[PDB]
Write a protein that binds this ligand. Structure first.
Ligand SMILES: [K+]
Ligand SMILES: [K+]
Ligand SMILES: [K+]
Ligand SMILES: [K+]
Ligand SMILES: [K+]
Ligand SMILES: [K+]
Ligand SMILES: [K+]
Ligand SMILES: [K+]
Ligand SMILES: [K+]
Ligand SMILES: [K+]
Ligand SMILES: [Mg+2]
Ligand SMILES: [Mg+2]
Ligand SMILES: [Mg+2]
Ligand SMILES: [Mg+2]
Ligand SMILES: [Mg+2]
Ligand SMILES: [Mg+2]
Ligand SMILES: [Mg+2]
Ligand SMILES: [Mg+2]
Ligand SMILES: [Mg+2]
Ligand SMILES: [Mg+2]
Ligand SMILES: [Mg+2]
Ligand SMILES: [Mg+2]
Ligand SMILES: [Mg+2]
Ligand SMILES: [Mg+2]
Ligand SMILES: [Mg+2]
Ligand SMILES: [Mg+2]
Ligand SMILES: [Mg+2]
Ligand SMILES: [Mg+2]
Ligand SMILES: [Mg+2]
Ligand SMILES: [Mg+2]
Ligand SMILES: [Mg+2]
Ligand SMILES: [Mg+2]
Ligand SMILES: [Mg+2]
Ligand SMILES: [Mg+2]
Ligand SMILES: [Mg+2]
Ligand SMILES: [Mg+2]
Ligand SMILES: [Mg+2]
Ligand SMILES: [Mg+2]
Ligand SMILES: [Mg+2]
Ligand SMILES: [Mg+2]
Ligand SMILES: [Mg+2]
Ligand SMILES: [Mg+2]
Ligand SMILES: [Mg+2]
Ligand SMILES: [Zn+2]
Lengths: 207, 168, 141, 38
RNA sequence: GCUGAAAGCAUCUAAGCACGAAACUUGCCCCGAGAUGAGUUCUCCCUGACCCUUUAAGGGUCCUGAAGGAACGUUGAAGAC
RNA sequence: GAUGUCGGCUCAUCACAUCCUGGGGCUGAAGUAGGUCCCAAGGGUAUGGCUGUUCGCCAUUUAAAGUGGUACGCGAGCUGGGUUUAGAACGUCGUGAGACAGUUCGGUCCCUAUCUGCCGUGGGCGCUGGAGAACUGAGGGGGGCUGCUCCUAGUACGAGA
RNA sequence: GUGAAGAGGGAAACAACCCAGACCGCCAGCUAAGGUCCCAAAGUCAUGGUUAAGUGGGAAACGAUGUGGGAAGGCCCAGACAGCGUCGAGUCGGCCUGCGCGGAAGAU
């Protein structure tokens, strides 16, 4: 399984031998098990977890009854982790960042920063046409988008301008630099998706 | 046809069991089972069933296979391999053959159920088993690690085989 | 005037068929016939007069020749270069119900009514169905 | 392997064999005589 | 390649068995139930009266207005809207 | 009662008769490195000098600098050097006006996208009481390149190299 | 000869090919070419053969113990054909012909 955390920000760890390690600081508070899915009832094995806190006025009655059945306080959302055949968990169990004590590498999933409507230069690394030499109104424009009468259409998946970022991204195989159970912190080497304050899903590295 | 006509003489201390198509020959070396082709009509005697155009061809193979099964569960089959090469070595440890064949890594060949191996010398392997197909396959697999080289004849050879060398 | 069946007074019965060992296409023509209602005297081209048919053991349907390995199912994803294929044996392994469903679909009329006719076919990979409440009669195709 | 439209015995030790719908020449004596029709 | 007849031999093949590549199916990442074949699981909410009439998944009247939603406002590392 | 025509730029997409990388048979294959044929389309597959050039030659890279189809892909996407308007001149032909599958200098490239398509992003209704969530995964897409050095080992191979 | 100046049915679609020449109406019947497992009207028709290649449902010289049929040969129980230092009946390879196989690489 993995845990849900929050991107606190980036800093560095100086080592004794004079290496500066860039780190993302992930706050991993206790993940509380809200539901256990099994083959009989649900058709697959998983835990649902919550973390953090939510204002009682913002917790709806359907949300509140779901937490109340688990016997846990409401957190800021619900996330599932699939269980391997060995793994087993109880409803209401707390899972801390100590899970990662002996984990060397993690995959971190988050929502990437939102670039809004992006051109082909930014979105797809298209090359600009001439700034000068007679270019008429066609500096950052995409150029040709197809052939001619054959095929007489644009193909699906054609790289064009549009929404960029604000989507789920996983960065794989990041070194775990420190697990600080006391302060509820995981330090991973290098950058992870999303803005400061955003939710992160951290799992032991699949590769 | 000619092969299919010839009857397989069942010796003493072998209990044949025709379960229709599934024939199971239990002897002193061990037991061997073989389901046959539908065209065959299995002393032991083999012949074609009606409405199969390749009945005699299928009868001849079935005869040949059960002949080998009878030899298998009585006396059994042996296949010898020789190693030719500076530093080429073999050694059995239970049911795994460890081979040194001039590679940077070890070569450990796990034997299947039935087959047993003995190294009388370090450059000889001697396989033994009831099933003629399986002992053939293991010997081919061991040979495949380092097939006889055409210049100096180096590699895992069968003891019988002639390696036709040539010179540069 | 010649009789016409009426959608709201059509009698549709439930049947269960075992596909085990049956030749795919020779099974499919009989399913298509009965889903369309061509076996009924009240057959009307613009009305679904056919029957509900459960097919069991779709994974044990038979084909002749070398079709188990050599019969290829093609589809295109709509993305350029997106021509995909699966052999009969691959289809049976992954999605066995689709073999019978695809065979029958190609033998049913094209258009809204043919799609409605196909909804009456219930194909299962194994020997059990969930439709005991519909009381399906055994049908030997 | 020689891949040819015309495959034939090149010596006495050559044998014609059909394998998986392909005419082949296999030779016990000479590896150069190995042929596949194609 | 193994075993193996047809074809007493031989034969990788006809029956049977094994190996074999960045191609194929997976494994990795993302979308994804308008998957109309519209799936599953968990939780939450509503427990009045009455009338007429081609009498049927019929149409009103009074009372009731939940869960939740939307709207509005302050806004955002979200965003052309 | 007009289907814009060379080259470049931008953006491509397919074929496989494969340039590289992968697998393999034969070799007049010792090894190293090649030759030749078979399989293989996953990904990858130069920058410059000269010329309008495509190409080509040349310099220097690279694992490689593939071959073709796509209106010799792509001007309602850009350019406008070439080329085929009007000016002018040379050579040449012609008595001349003028002319040249000769050369030379100069010389206007329009369009606010309705439909299809494509990239994004909402609204509606549906999914059978209504509602808030978490999902399963049919199906679809992305990705898939490779150098050099060291060890194995100066080992196998080789008379050495 | 047809189209042009000709509709209808067949050949998926297809002026010019095949069948056939539309005066109007019919919710009658018989046929033509072409068809009769489902899309889609009518044989999952009957009898005897062939093919195993999805050949049928592209492609030649040429290549091959694929497989069916036919006529005639050589050798052979004085023992043939591989074993022929062997035992116990077929064996060899031309000819003709039916149907298949390889030869067979292309761009949404
Ligand atoms: K749904
Ligand atoms: K191209
Ligand atoms: K080679
Ligand atoms: K490729
Ligand atoms: K142009
Ligand atoms: K245009
Ligand atoms: K323009
Ligand atoms: K249109
Ligand atoms: K006429
Ligand atoms: K075909
Ligand atoms: Mg933004
Ligand atoms: Mg540029
Ligand atoms: Mg302008
Ligand atoms: Mg400008
Ligand atoms: Mg089109
Ligand atoms: Mg139709
Ligand atoms: Mg093969
Ligand atoms: Mg043999
Ligand atoms: Mg690679
Ligand atoms: Mg016009
Ligand atoms: Mg090729
Ligand atoms: Mg590709
Ligand atoms: Mg492909
Ligand atoms: Mg792959
Ligand atoms: Mg150049
Ligand atoms: Mg062009
Ligand atoms: Mg091109
Ligand atoms: Mg254009
Ligand atoms: Mg110009
Ligand atoms: Mg002039
Ligand atoms: Mg323009
Ligand atoms: Mg995929
Ligand atoms: Mg893809
Ligand atoms: Mg005229
Ligand atoms: Mg006509
Ligand atoms: Mg007509
Ligand atoms: Mg027609
Ligand atoms: Mg009639
Ligand atoms: Mg007729
Ligand atoms: Mg019919
Ligand atoms: Mg019949
Ligand atoms: Mg064909
Ligand atoms: Mg041919
Ligand atoms: Zn030869």
């Amino acid at each position: 399984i993995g845990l849900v955390g929050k991107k606190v920000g980036m800093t560095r760890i100086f080592t004794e031998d004079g290496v500066s390690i860039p780190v993302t600081v992930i706050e991993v508070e206790a993940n509380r098990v809200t539901q256990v899915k099994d083959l009989a009832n649900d058709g697959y094995r998983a835990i649902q977890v919550t973390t953090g806190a939510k204002k009682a006025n913002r917790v709806t009655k359907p949300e509140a009854g779901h937490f109340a059945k688990a016997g846990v306080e409401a957190g800021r959302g619900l996330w599932e982790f699939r269980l391997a055949e060995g793994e087993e968990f109880t409803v209401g169990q707390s899972i801390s960042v100590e899970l990662f004590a002996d984990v060397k590498k993690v995959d971190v999933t988050g929502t990437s920063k939102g670039k809004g409507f992006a051109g082909t230069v930014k979105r797809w690394n298209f090359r600009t046409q001439d700034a000068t030499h007679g270019n008429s109104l066609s500096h950052r424009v995409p150029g040709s988008i197809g052939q001619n009468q054959t095929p007489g259409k644009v193909f699906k998946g054609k790289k064009m301008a549009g929404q960029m970022g604000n989507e789920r991204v996983t960065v794989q195989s990041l070194d775990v630099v420190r697990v600080d159970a006391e302060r509820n912190l995981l330090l991973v080497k290098g950058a992870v998706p999303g803005a400061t304050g955003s939710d992160l899903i951290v799992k032991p590295a699949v590769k | 046809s000619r092969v299919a006509k010839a009857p397989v003489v069942v010796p003493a201390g072998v209990d044949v069991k025709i379960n229709g198509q599934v024939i199971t020959i239990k002897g002193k070396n061990g037991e061997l089972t073989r389901t046959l082709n539908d065209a065959v009509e299995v002393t032991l005697t083999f012949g074609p069933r009606d409405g199969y155009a390749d009945g005699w061809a299928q009868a001849g193979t079935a005869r040949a296979l059960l002949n080998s099964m009878v030899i298998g569960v009585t006396e059994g089959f042996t296949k010898k391999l020789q190693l030719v090469g500076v530093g080429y070595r073999a050694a059995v440890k239970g049911n795994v053959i460890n081979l040194s064949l001039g590679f940077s890594h070890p070569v450990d060949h796990q034997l299947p159920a039935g087959i047993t191996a003995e190294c009388p010398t370090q450059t000889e392997i001697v396989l033994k088993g009831a099933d003629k197909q399986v002992i053939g396959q293991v010997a081919a697999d061991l040979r495949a690690y380092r097939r006889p080289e055409p210049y100096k004849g180096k590699g895992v050879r069968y003891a019988d085989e002639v390696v036709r060398t040539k010179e540069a | 005037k010649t009789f016409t069946a009426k959608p709201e007074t059509v009698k549709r019965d439930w049947y269960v068929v075992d596909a085990t060992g049956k030749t795919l296409g020779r099974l499919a023509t009989e399913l298509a016939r009965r889903l369309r209602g061509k076996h009924k005297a009240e057959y009307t081209p613009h009305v679904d007069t056919g029957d509900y048919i459960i097919v069991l053991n779709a994974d044990k349907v038979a084909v002749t020749g070398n079709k188990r390995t050599d019969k290829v199912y093609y589809h295109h994803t709509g993305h350029i270069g997106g021509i995909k294929q699966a052999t009969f044996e691959e289809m049976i392994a992954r999605r066995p119900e689709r073999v019978i469903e695809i065979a029958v679909k190609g033998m049913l009329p094209k258009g809204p009514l043919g799609r409605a006719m196909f909804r009456k076919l219930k194909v299962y990979a194994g020997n059990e169905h969930n439709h005991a409440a519909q009381q399906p009669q055994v049908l030997d195709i | 392997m020689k891949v040819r439209a015309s495959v034939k015995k090149l010596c006495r030790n050559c044998k014609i064999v059909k394998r998986d719908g392909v005419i082949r020449v296999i030779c016990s004596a000479e590896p150069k005589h190995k042929q596949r029709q194609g």
